[PDB]
Design a protein around this ligand. Structure first.
Ligand SMILES: Nc1ncnc2c1ncn2[C@@H]1O[C@H](COP(=O)(O)OP(=O)(O)O)[C@@H](O)[C@H]1O
Ligand SMILES: Nc1ncnc2c1ncn2[C@@H]1O[C@H](COP(=O)(O)OP(=O)(O)O)[C@@H](O)[C@H]1O
Lengths: 266, 270
């Protein structure tokens, strides 16, 4: 059985699709395979907020559910529904997709089409949270609006910023078009390159090209060319205007305080 | 520093006015303030095409450049120039306005009256695009001719139909404001849903004027919900259909035609 989709973020609606695939495969006595289309079509348009994560991180999460195969957007956008089925679905009896699934040139292929070709299509209903349908777009907007505390309810976890490399650390996220947080300062949970978990204050600013710098707390080693994962816990304050230290000093007090509070709640 | 004008649409010319204000504010280590006049005098005269957007939308765009304040055209058209300066410009050493700037009783107030009061005034030359001077009036006319594809070079973005939601087609209620109407017909649109989701739609403009949109690859009730729609292309003229079957034919072709254009847009990227 094969589920097909982008699964950007692998949010709770996506997990819904993937768990249903596994169950479907169980009762069908078939193997499970996930086809993840590298980029949604909107990805190439100017106003695209950006992906929640890299295709690589994504595959790494999809992989926790089943064999995951990346369908390369450039390699499929021009295929006919038939061409698509023949090349990626030969010998596939069932595909699990979200509602209004589309494929092939001019989004001409749909669940109906797949059915007329003998493939049975399980169309999973979107998960709704707080009267809202879970989806990459919705989550992508919260990231842009800096509403990072509201994300877990839709994403299934905290939005994460990842990459390589008072002092502060510059997180290069890669050449991928990823969504950017609202300019500003955040309280983040920093996963270190050794199971170490610390807290940091993160600034997101320009120079067009949003930057992500993080001041880790109770840390002092050289992280340079090392990877870094940061759970974005809360939006502290909007971006601001050499009294810099003064403000970037209260941020740390604010950090310690929030941190101290989480702890108090035994 | 203060900027003053109607700014219907916040087109690129308006944007040149506003950015200039911010550059001057930065230069002087001062604050910016935008005064947007509710309506141009034409809004109350014969044959006004209508605004490009509501004051409410306008102030939302304006507010991203700086603290904004609306001025009732009626609460100021009667004021004498002096009065205007007396009520709105105290302490202000710089104003940035477009060309043909006017204010006060019988449009007697101008940049000259303002410069002669110690207030420096910077009139920004209209922006020229494709040999034409960018103006709200010019854009209103394109919308009217449905020439929606040529709009962004002037407006700086696609024209928008915005409103409350009144096969299935979502009915957009634009509000009670006097808005410019698109040339009746069928358009391909980019629908911005509440979630923050973007789909494409096929919009129909009929005949007041009716705005109907069928959102593609979408299922859901949208009553009382606000939709913003970028009008991307004019697909075809309105067309009468005697038999009701010829309609579905066309409707079907429309969604189809939309999907093709949508594919073209996506591939135009390379
Ligand atoms: N407490 C810390 N928090 C973040 N980075 C640190 C810390 N201590 C040392 N570093 C390291 O210091 C370097 C950042 O150096 P610096 O030039 O001072 O700042 P930046 O490059 O962000 O402008 C990185 O390689 C980073 O891994
Ligand atoms: N794909 C869609 N496009 C437009 N509206 C849709 C779509 N799917 C569901 N709807 C919903 O259907 C309703 C439109 O209903 P209907 O009365 O049949 O349309 P109309 O009278 O304008 O032809 C709205 O509540 C709308 O949100």
């Amino acid at each position: 059985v094969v589920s097909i989709g982008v699964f950007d973020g692998v949010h709770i609606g996506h997990q819904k699709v993937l768990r249903t695939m596994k169950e479907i495969a169980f009762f069908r006595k078939d193997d499970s395979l996930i086809y993840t289309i590298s980029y949604p079509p909107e990805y190439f348009l100017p106003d695209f907020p950006g992906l929640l994560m890299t295709v690589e991180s994504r595959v790494e999460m999809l992989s926790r559910y089943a064999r995951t195969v990346v369908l390369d957007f450039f390699r499929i956008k021009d295929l006919t529904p038939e061409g698509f089925v023949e090349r990626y679905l030969s010998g596939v009896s069932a595909v699990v997709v979200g509602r209004d699934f589309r494929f092939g040139k001019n989004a001409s292929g749909n669940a109906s089409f797949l059915r007329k070709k003998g493939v049975e299509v399980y169309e999973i209903e979107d998960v709704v949270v707080q009267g809202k349908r879970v989806s990459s777009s919705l989550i992508r907007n919260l990231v842009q609006e800096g509403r990072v505390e509201e994300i877990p309810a839709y994403l299934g976890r905290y939005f994460e910023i990842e990459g390589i490399v008072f002092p502060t650390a510059n997180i290069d996220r890669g050449n991928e078009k990823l969504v950017d947080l609202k300019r500003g300062v955040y309280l983040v949970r920093v996963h270190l390159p050794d199971g170490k978990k610390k807290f940091g204050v993160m600034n997101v600013g320009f120079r067009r090209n949003v930057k992500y710098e993080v001041y880790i707390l109770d840390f002092e080693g050289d992280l340079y060319g090392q990877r870094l994962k940061l759970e974005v816990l809360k939006f502290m304050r909007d971006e601001k205007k050499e009294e810099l230290k003064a403000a970037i000093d209260q941020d740390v007090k604010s950090a310690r305080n929030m941190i101290d509070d989480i702890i108090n709640s035994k």
